[PDB]
Design a protein around this ligand. Structure first.
Ligand SMILES: C[C@H](NC(=O)[C@H](CCCNC(=N)N)NC(=O)[C@H](C)NC(=O)[C@@H](N)CO)C(=O)NCc1ccc(/N=N/c2ccc(CO)cc2)cc1
Length: 300
């Protein structure tokens, strides 16, 4: 593949924590330590609007499946749901007793999952803003939470070194993924077809798990990840890649099945905390920490 820099997006006055393409493919949303959400044109990199409300910085942000709603996870121990077009804050989800780190809508977008430094995972009702469930998920901060394709499953990861898979409806743990040693898991998500999960660990290692068999299938290295919870992705619109940020300021792209680094992206001046893949085009968004403060758009 041949991702080349097309756009640099400037505006956040602090570190960007997370970037996400809207499912309809028209927008990019960005979260920052500057307590703000910014929305950008996915194709032209053009600034669109600021969404504000959080009392502290934001670690994560997620789109509903109809691109109308945003959820954001903040250090002010709350989530807020946002009507994107109007800018309204529709609900504030309160219940976490520490930094909310990660969040996600289910496909049906009637639920939100959140993971927190209170070591718990919570399931929220979108429409009412009420917490449906609280799972005793981990013995250390929750780094990532994610629904599978049909929303039946949740996967969560944690500095405790574990990935657990949860039944959305009943809240019971269906599986604990554990390998030959448990370095902290910094990131986790299902593959789009929901057959696999990708997990990132603070030992400079990406791992592709077959979660039904419960066996680790592929491993992806060469990048540097010993400290931050760096988002990683499946790119599936062109070839099949793994895409991850890295603490050496590069964006890394691997061939999924042969595991070879096929492209390193240059440009950022600080840790690439976050990357995102466009739902229908060969586009990547990447974002960096305090010394860089920019978002880059790469097209292939
Ligand atoms: C701005 C950025 N924020 C974060 O790295 C994370 C969210 C990263 C992306 N979000 C996601 N993956 N869901 N958030 C935070 O650190 C805190 C909770 N919140 C904020 O910073 C917000 N203001 C904005 O995100 C940051 O640099 N925080 C400071 C920091 C300090 C130490 C650290 N790990 N340091 C270590 C970790 C482990 C070890 C030994 O194992 C040693 C050092 C990791 C981060």
């Amino acid at each position: 593949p041949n991702y080349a820099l097309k756009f640099t997006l400037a505006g956040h006055t602090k570190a960007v924590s997370s970037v996400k393409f809207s499912p309809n493919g028209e927008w990019l949303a960005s979260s920052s330590a500057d307590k703000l959400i910014k929305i950008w044109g996915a194709y032209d990199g053009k600034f669109e609007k600021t969404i504000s409300g959080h009392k502290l910085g934001i670690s994560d942000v997620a789109w509903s499946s109809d691109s109308n709603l945003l959820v954001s996870a903040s250090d002010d121990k709350t989530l807020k749901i946002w009507d994107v077009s109007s800018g309204k804050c529709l609900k504030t989800l309160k219940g976490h007793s520490n930094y909310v780190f990660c969040c996600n809508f289910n496909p049906q977008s009637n639920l939100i999952v959140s993971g927190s430094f209170d070591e718990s995972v919570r399931i929220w009702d979108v429409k009412t803003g009420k917490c449906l469930k609280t799972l005793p998920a981990h013995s250390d901060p929750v780094s990532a939470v994610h629904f599978n394709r049909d929303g039946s499953l949740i996967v969560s990861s944690s500095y405790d070194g574990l990935c657990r898979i949860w039944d959305t409806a009943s809240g019971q743990c269906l599986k604990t993924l554990i390998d030959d040693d448990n370095p902290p898991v910094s990131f986790v998500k299902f593959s789009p077809n929901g057959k696999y999960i990708l997990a990132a660990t603070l030992d400079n290692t990406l791992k592709l798990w077959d979660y039904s068999k419960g066996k680790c299938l592929k491993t992806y290295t060469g990048h540097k990840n010993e400290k931050y919870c760096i988002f990683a992705n499946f790119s599936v619109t062109g070839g099949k890649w793994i895409v991850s940020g890295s603490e050496d300021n590069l964006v890394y792209i691997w061939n999924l099945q042969t595991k070879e680094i096929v492209q390193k992206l240059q440009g950022h001046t600080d840790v690439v905390i976050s990357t995102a893949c466009h739902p229908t085009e060969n586009i990547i968004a990447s974002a960096a920490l305090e010394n860089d403060k920019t978002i880059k758009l790469w097209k292939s």
